[PDB]
PDB file of C-alpha atoms and ligand atoms in Angstrom:
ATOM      1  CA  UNK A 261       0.000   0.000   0.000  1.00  0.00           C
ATOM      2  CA  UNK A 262       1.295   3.417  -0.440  1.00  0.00           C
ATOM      3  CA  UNK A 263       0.169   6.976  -0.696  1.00  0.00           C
ATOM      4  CA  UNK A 264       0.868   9.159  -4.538  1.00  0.00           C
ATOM      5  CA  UNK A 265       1.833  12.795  -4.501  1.00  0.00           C
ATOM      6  CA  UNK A 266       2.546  14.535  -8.233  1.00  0.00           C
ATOM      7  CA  UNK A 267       2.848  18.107  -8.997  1.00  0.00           C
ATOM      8  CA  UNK A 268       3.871  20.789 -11.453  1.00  0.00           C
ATOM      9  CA  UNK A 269       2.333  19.061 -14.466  1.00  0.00           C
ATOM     10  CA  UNK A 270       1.254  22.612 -16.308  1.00  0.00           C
ATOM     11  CA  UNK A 271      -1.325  20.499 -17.828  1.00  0.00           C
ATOM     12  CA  UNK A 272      -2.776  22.665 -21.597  1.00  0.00           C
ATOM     13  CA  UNK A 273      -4.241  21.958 -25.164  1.00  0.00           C
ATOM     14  CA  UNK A 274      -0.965  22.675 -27.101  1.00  0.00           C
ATOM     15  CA  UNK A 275       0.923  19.770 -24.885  1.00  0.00           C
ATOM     16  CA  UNK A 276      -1.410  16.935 -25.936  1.00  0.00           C
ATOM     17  CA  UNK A 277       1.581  14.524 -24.596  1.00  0.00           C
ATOM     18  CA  UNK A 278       1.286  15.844 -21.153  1.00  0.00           C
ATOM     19  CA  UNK A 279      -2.294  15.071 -21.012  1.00  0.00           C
ATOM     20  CA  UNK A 280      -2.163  11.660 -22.633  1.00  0.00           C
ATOM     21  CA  UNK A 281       0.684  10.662 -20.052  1.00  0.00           C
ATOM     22  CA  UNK A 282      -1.709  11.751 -17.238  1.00  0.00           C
ATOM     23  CA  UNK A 283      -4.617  10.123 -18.389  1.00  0.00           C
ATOM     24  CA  UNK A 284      -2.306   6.798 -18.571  1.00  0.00           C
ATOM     25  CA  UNK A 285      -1.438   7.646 -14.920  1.00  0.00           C
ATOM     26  CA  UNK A 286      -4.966   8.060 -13.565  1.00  0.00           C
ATOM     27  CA  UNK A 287      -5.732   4.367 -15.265  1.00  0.00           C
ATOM     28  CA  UNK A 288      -3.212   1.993 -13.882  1.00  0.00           C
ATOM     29  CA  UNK A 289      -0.365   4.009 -11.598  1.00  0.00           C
ATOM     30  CA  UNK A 290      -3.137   5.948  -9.875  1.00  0.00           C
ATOM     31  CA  UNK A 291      -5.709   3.276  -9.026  1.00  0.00           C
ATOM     32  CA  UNK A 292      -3.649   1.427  -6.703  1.00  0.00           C
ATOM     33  CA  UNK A 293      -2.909   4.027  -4.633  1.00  0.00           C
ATOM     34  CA  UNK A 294      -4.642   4.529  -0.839  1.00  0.00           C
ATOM     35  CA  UNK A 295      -4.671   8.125  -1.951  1.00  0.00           C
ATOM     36  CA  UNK A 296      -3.616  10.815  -4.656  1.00  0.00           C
ATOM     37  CA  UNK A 297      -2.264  14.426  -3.820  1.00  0.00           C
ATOM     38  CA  UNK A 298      -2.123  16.903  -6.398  1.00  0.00           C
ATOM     39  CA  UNK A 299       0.233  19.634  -4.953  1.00  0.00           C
ATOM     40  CA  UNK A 300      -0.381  22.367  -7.317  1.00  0.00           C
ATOM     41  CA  UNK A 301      -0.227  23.401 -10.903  1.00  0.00           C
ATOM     42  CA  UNK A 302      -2.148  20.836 -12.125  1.00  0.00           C
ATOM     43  CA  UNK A 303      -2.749  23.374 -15.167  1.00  0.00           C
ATOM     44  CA  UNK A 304      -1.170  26.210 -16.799  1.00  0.00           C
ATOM     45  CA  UNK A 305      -3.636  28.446 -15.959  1.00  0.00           C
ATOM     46  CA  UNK A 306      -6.847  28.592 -14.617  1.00  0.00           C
ATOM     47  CA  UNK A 307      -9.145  31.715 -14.919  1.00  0.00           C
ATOM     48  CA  UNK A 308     -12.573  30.129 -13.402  1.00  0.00           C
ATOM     49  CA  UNK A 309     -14.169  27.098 -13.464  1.00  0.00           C
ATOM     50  CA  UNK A 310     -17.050  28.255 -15.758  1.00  0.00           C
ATOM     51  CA  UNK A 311     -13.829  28.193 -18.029  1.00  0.00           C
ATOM     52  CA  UNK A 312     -15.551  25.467 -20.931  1.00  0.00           C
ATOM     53  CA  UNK A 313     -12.048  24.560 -21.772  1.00  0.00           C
ATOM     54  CA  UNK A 314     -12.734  20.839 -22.850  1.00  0.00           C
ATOM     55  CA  UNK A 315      -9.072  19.656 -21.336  1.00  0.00           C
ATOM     56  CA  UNK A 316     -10.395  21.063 -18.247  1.00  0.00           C
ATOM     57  CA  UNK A 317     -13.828  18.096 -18.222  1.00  0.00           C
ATOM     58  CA  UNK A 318     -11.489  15.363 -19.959  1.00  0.00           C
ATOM     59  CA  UNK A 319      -9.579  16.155 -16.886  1.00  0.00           C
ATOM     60  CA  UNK A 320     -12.304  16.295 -14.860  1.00  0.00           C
ATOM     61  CA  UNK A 321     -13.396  12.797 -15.535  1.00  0.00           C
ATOM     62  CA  UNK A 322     -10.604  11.165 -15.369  1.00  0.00           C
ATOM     63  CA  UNK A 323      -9.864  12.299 -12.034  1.00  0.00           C
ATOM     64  CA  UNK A 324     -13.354  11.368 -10.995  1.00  0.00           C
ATOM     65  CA  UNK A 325     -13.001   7.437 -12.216  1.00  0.00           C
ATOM     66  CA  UNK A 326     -10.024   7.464  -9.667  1.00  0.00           C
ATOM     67  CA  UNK A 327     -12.137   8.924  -7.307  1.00  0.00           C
ATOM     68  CA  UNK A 328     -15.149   6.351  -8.046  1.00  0.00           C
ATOM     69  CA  UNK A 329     -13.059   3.584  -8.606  1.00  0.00           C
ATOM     70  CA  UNK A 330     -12.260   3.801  -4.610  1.00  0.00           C
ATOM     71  CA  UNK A 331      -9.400   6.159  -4.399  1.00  0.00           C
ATOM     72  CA  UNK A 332      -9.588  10.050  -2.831  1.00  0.00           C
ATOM     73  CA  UNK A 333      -8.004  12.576  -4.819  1.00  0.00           C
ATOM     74  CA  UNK A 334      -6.595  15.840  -2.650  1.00  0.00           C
ATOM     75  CA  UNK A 335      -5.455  19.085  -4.298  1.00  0.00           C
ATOM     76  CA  UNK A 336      -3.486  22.269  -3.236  1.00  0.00           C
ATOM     77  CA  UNK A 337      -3.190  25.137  -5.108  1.00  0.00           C
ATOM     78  CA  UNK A 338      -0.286  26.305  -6.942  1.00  0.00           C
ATOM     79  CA  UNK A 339       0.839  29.660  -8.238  1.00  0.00           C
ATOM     80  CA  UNK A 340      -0.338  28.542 -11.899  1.00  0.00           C
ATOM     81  CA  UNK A 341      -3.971  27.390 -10.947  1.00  0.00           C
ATOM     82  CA  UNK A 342      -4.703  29.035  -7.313  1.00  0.00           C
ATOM     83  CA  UNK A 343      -8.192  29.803  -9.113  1.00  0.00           C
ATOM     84  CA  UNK A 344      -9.569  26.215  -9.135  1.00  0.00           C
ATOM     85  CA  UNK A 345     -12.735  26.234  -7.187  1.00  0.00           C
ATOM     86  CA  UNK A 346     -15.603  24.240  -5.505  1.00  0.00           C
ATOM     87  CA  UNK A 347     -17.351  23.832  -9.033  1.00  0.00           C
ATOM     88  CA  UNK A 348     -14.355  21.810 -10.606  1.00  0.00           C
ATOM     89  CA  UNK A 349     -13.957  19.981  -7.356  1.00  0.00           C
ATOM     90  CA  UNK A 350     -17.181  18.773  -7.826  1.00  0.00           C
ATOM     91  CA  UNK A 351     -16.747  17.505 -11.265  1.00  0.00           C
ATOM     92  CA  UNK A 352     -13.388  15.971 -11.014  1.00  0.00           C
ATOM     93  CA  UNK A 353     -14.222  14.252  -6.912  1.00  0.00           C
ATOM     94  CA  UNK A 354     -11.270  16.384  -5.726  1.00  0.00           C
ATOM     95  CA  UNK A 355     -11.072  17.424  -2.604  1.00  0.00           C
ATOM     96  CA  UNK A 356      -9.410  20.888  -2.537  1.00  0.00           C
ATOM     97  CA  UNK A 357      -6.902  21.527   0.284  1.00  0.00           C
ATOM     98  CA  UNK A 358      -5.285  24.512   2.081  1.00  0.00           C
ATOM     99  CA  UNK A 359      -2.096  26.528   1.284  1.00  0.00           C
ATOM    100  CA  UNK A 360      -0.467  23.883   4.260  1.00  0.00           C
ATOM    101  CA  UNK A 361      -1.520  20.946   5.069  1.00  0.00           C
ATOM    102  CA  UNK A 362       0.306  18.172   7.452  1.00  0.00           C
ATOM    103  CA  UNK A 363      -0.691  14.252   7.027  1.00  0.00           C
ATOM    104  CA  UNK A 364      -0.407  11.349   9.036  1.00  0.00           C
ATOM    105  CA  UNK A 365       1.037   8.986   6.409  1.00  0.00           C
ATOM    106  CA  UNK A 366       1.311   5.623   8.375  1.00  0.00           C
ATOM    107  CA  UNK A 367       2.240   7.186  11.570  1.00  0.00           C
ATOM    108  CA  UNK A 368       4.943   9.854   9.924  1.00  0.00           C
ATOM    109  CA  UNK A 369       3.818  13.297  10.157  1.00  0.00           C
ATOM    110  CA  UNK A 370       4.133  14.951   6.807  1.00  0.00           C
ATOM    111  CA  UNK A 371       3.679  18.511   5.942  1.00  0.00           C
ATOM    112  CA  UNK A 372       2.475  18.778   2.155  1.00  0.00           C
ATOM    113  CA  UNK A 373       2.647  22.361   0.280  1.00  0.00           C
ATOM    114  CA  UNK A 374       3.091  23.860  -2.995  1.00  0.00           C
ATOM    115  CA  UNK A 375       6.339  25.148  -2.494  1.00  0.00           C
ATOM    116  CA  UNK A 376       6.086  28.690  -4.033  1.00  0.00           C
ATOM    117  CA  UNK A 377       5.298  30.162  -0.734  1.00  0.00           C
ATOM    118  CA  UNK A 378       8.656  28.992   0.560  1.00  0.00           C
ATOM    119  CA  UNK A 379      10.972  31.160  -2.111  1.00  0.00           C
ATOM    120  CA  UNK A 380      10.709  34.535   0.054  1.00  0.00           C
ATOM    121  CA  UNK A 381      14.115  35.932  -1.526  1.00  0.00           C
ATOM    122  CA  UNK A 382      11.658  36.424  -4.802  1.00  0.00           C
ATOM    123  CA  UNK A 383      10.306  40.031  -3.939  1.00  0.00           C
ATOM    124  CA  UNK A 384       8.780  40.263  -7.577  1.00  0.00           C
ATOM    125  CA  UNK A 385       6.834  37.032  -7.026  1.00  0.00           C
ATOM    126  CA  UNK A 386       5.690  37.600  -3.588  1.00  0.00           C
ATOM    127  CA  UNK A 387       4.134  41.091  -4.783  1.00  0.00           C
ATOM    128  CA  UNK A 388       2.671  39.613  -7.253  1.00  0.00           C
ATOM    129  CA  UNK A 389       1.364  36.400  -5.322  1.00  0.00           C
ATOM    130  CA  UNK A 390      -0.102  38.736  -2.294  1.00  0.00           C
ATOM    131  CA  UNK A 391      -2.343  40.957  -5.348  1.00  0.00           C
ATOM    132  CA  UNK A 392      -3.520  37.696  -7.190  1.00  0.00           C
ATOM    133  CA  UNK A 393      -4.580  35.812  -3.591  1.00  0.00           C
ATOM    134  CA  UNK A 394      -6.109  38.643  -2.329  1.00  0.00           C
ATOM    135  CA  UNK A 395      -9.875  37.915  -2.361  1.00  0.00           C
ATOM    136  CA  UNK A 396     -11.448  41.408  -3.551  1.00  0.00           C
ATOM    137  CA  UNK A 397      -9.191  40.960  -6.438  1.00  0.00           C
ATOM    138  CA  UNK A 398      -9.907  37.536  -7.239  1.00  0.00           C
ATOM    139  CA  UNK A 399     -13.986  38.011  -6.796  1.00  0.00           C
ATOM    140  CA  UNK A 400     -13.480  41.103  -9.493  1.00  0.00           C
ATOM    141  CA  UNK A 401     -11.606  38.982 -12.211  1.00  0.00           C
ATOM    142  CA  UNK A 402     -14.231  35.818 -11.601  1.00  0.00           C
ATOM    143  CA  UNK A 403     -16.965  38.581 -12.275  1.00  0.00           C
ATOM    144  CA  UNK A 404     -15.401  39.622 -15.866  1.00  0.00           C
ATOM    145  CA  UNK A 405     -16.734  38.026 -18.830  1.00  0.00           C
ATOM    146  CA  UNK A 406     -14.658  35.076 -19.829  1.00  0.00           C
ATOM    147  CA  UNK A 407     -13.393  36.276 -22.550  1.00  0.00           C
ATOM    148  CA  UNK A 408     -11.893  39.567 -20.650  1.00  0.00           C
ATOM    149  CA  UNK A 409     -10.133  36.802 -18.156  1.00  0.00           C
ATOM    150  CA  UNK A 410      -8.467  35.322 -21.139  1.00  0.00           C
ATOM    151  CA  UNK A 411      -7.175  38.493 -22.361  1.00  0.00           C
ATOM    152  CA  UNK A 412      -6.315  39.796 -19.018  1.00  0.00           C
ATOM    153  CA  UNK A 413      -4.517  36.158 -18.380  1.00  0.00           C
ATOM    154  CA  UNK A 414      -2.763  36.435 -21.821  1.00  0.00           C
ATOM    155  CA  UNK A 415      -1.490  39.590 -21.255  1.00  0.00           C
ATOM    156  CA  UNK A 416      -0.155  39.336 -17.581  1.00  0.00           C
ATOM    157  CA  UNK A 417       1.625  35.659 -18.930  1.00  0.00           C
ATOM    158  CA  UNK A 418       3.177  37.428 -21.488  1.00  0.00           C
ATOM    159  CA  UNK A 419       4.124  40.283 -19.377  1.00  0.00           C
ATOM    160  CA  UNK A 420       5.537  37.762 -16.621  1.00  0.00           C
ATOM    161  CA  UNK A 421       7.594  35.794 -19.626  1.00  0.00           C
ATOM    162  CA  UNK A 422      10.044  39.020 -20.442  1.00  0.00           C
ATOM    163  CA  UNK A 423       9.692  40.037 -16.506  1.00  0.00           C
ATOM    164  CA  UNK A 424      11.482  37.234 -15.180  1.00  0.00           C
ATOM    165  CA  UNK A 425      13.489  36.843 -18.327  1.00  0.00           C
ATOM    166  CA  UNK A 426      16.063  39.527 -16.115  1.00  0.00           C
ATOM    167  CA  UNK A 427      15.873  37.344 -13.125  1.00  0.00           C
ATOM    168  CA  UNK A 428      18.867  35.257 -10.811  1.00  0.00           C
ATOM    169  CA  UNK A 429      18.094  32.004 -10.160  1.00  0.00           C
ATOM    170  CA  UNK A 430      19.538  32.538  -6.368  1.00  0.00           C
ATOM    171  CA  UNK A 431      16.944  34.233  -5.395  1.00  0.00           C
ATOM    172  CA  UNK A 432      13.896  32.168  -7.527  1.00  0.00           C
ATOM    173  CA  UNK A 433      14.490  28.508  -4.843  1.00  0.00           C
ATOM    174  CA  UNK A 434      13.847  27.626  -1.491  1.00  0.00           C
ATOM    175  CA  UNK A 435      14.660  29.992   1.195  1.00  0.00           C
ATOM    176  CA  UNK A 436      16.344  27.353   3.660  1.00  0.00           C
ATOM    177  CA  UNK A 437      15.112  29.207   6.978  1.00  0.00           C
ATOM    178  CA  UNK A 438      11.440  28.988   5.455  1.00  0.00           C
ATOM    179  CA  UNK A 439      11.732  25.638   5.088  1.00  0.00           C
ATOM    180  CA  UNK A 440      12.535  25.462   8.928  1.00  0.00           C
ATOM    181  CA  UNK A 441      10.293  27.945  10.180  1.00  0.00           C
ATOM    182  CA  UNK A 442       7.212  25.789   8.132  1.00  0.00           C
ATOM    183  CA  UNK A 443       8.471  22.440   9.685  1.00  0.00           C
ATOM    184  CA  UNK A 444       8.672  23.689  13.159  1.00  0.00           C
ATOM    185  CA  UNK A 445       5.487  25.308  12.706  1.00  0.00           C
ATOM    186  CA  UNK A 446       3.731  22.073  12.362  1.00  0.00           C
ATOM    187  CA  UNK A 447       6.231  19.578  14.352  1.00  0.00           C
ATOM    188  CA  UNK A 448       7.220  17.270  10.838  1.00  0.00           C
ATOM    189  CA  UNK A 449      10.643  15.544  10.271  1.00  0.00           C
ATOM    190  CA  UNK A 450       9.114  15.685   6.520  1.00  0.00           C
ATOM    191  CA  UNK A 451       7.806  17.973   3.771  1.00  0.00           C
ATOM    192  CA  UNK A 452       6.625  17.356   0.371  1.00  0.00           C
ATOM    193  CA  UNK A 453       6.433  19.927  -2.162  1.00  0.00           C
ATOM    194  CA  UNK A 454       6.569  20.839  -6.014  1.00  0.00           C
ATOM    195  CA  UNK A 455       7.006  24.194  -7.681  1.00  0.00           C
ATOM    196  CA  UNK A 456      10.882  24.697  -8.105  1.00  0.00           C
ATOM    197  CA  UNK A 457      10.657  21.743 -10.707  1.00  0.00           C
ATOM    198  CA  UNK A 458      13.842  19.913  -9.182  1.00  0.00           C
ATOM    199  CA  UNK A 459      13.379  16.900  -8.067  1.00  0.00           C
ATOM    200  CA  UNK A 460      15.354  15.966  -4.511  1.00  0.00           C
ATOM    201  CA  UNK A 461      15.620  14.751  -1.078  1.00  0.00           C
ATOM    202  CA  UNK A 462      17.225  17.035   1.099  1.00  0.00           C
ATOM    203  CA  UNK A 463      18.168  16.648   4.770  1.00  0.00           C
ATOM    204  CA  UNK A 464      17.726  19.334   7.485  1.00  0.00           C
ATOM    205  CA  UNK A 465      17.411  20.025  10.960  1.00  0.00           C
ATOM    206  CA  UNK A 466      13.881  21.034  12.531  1.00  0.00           C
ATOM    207  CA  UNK A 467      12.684  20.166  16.023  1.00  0.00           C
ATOM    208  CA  UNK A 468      16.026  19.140  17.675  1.00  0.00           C
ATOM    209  CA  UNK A 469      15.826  15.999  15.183  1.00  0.00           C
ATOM    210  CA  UNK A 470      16.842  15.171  11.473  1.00  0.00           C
ATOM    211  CA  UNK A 471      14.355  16.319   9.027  1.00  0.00           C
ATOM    212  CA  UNK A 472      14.016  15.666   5.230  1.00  0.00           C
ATOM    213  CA  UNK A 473      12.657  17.580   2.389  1.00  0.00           C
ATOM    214  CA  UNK A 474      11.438  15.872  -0.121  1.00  0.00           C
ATOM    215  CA  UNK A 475      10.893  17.703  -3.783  1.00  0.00           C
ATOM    216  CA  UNK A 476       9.034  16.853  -6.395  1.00  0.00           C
ATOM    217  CA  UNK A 477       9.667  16.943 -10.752  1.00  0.00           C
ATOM    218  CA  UNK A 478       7.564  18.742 -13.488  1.00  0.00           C
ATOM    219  CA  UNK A 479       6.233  16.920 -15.810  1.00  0.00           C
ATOM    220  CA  UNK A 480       8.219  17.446 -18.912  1.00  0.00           C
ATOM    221  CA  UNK A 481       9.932  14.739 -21.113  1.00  0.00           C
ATOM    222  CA  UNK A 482       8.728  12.109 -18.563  1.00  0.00           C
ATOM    223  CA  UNK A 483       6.528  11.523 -15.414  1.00  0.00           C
ATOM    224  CA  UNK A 484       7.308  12.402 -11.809  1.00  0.00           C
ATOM    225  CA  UNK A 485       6.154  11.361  -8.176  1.00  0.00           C
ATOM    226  CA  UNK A 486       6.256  10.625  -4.711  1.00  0.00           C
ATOM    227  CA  UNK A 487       5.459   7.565  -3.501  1.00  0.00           C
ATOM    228  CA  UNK A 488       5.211   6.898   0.732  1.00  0.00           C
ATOM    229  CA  UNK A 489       4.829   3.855   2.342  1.00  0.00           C
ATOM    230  CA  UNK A 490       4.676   2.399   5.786  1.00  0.00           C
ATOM    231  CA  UNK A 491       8.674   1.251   4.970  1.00  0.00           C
ATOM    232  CA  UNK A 492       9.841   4.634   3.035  1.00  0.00           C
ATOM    233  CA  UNK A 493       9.466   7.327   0.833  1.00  0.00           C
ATOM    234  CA  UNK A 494       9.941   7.175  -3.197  1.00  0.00           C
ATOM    235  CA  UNK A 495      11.055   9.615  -5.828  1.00  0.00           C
ATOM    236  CA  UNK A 496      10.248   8.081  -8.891  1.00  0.00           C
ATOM    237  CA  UNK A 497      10.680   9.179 -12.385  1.00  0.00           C
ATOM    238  CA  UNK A 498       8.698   7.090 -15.254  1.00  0.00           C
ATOM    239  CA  UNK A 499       7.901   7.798 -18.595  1.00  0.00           C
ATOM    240  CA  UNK A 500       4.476   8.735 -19.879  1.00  0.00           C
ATOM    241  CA  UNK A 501       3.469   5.424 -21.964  1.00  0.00           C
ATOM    242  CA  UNK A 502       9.994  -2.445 -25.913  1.00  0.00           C
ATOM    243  CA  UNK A 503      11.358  -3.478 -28.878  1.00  0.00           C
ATOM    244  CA  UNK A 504      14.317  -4.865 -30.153  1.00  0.00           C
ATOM    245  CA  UNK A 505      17.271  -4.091 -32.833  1.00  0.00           C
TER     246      UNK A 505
HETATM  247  C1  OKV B 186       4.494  33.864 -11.322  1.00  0.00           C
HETATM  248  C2  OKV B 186       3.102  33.311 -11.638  1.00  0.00           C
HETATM  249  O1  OKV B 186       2.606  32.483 -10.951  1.00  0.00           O
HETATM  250  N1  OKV B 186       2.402  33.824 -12.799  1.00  0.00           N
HETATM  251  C3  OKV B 186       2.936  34.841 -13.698  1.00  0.00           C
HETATM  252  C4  OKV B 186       1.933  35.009 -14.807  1.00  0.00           C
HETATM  253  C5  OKV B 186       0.767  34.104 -14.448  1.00  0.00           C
HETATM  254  C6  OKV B 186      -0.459  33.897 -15.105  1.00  0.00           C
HETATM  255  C7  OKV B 186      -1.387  33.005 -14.573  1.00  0.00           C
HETATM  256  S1  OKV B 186      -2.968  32.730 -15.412  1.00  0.00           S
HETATM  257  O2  OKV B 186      -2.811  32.953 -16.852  1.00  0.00           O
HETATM  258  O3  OKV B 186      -3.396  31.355 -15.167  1.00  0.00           O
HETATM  259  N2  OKV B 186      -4.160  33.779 -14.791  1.00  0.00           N
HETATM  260  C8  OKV B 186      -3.703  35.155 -14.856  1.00  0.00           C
HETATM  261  C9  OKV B 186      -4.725  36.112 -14.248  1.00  0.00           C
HETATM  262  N3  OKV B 186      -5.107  35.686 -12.884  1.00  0.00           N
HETATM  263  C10 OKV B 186      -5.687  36.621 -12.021  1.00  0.00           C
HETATM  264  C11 OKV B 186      -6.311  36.202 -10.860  1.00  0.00           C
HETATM  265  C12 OKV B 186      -6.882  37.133 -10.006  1.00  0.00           C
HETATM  266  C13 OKV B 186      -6.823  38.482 -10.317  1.00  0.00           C
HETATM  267  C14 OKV B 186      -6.197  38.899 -11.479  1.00  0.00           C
HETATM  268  C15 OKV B 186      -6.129  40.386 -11.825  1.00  0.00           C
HETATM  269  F1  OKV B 186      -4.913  40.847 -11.551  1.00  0.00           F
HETATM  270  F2  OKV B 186      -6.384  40.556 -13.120  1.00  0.00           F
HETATM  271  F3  OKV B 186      -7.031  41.050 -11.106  1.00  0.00           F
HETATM  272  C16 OKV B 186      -5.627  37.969 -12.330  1.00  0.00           C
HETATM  273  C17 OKV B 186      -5.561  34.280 -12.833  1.00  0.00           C
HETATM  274  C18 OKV B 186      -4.521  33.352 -13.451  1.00  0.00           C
HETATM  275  C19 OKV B 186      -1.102  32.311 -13.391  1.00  0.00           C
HETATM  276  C20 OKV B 186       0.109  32.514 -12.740  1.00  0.00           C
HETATM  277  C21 OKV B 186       1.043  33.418 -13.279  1.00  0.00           C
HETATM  278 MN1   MN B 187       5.352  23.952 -11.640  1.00  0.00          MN
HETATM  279 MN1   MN B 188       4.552  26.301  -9.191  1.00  0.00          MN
END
């Protein structure tokens, strides 16, 4: 038995490979599992769930056969798709959870997160993460016709792409104290997260005691995931979907 946790899959129409690696996923990897955690940026974007973006029901339903066929789906928002809502959770079975959330995976105590909220030596991101979260703003965008969201979203993507285009990588990762401060906050020797798309086990100290962060991959040429256990914890990389010369 075990417990799956993917993230940072940036899920959209022009990456039909993406899609079709998830959907082989959510038939066979995923319906083993006790449950599934989604820890952000499921999609690319996300401008409201009365979006009719067909990827967005395909999704939907597959998500919701794992669900029926016996195993709860979980999913925290990322910085891509923080506008996912009730409605969607209802037609995919998901069960939408906050910013931090800690488990109790076979006894371990495991703090689960998106991961963007831990790079606090961004000062362009974190602006821009406290105006998008903020609800007055978000309740005005949902109230736009659709087709103002989408040119609002293109616009502020494309603005964002030659933005951080003049940006260090130092100060884009994981701020180390935030990673301490969050553990301590909640008492875990362990933290899964996505978000900074590198996929690693790192060991700390939090509480007095060893402590391990555990990072997971974007879904690009191949699949990503975490995989706990009652024994251990997994990083596995797979591909999407043999023959001989
Ligand atoms: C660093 C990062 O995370 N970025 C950078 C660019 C980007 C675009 C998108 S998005 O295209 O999916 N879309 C954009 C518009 N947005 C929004 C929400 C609430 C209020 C408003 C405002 F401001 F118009 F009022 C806009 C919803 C999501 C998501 C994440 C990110
Ligand atoms: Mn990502
Ligand atoms: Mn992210």
């Amino acid at each position: 038995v075990a417990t799956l946790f993917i993230a940072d899959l940036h899920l959209q129409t022009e990456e039909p490979a993406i899609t079709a690696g998830f959907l082989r996923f959510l038939q066979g990897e995923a319906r083993q599992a006790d449950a599934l955690y989604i820890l952000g940026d499921l999609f690319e974007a996300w401008i409201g769930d009365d979006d009719p973006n067909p990827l967005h029901q395909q999704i939907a339903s597959a998500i919701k056969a794992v669900v029926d066929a016996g195993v709860p789906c979980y999913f925290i928002h990322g910085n891509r798709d923080f506008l996912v809502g009730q409605r969607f959770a209802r037609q995919s079975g998901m069960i939408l959870l906050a910013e931090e959330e800690r488990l109790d995976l076979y006894g371990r105590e495991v703090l689960i997160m998106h991961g963007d909220t831990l790079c606090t030596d961004d000062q362009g991101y974190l602006a821009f993460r406290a105006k998008v979260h903020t609800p007055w703003i978000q309740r005005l965008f949902l109230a736009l016709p659709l087709f103002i969201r989408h040119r609002i979203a293109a616009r502020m993507r494309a603005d964002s792409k030659a933005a951080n285009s003049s940006k260090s990588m130092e100060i884009m990762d994981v701020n180390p104290q935030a990673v301490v401060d969050a553990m301590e906050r909640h008492h875990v020797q362990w933290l899964i997260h996505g978000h900074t798309h590198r996929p690693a086990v790192h060991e700390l100290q939090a509480n007095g005691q060893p402590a391990w962060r555990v990072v997971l991959g974007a879904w690009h040429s191949e699949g990503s995931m975490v995989k706990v256990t009652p024994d251990d914890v997994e990083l596995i990389h797979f591909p999407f979907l043999l023959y001989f010369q």
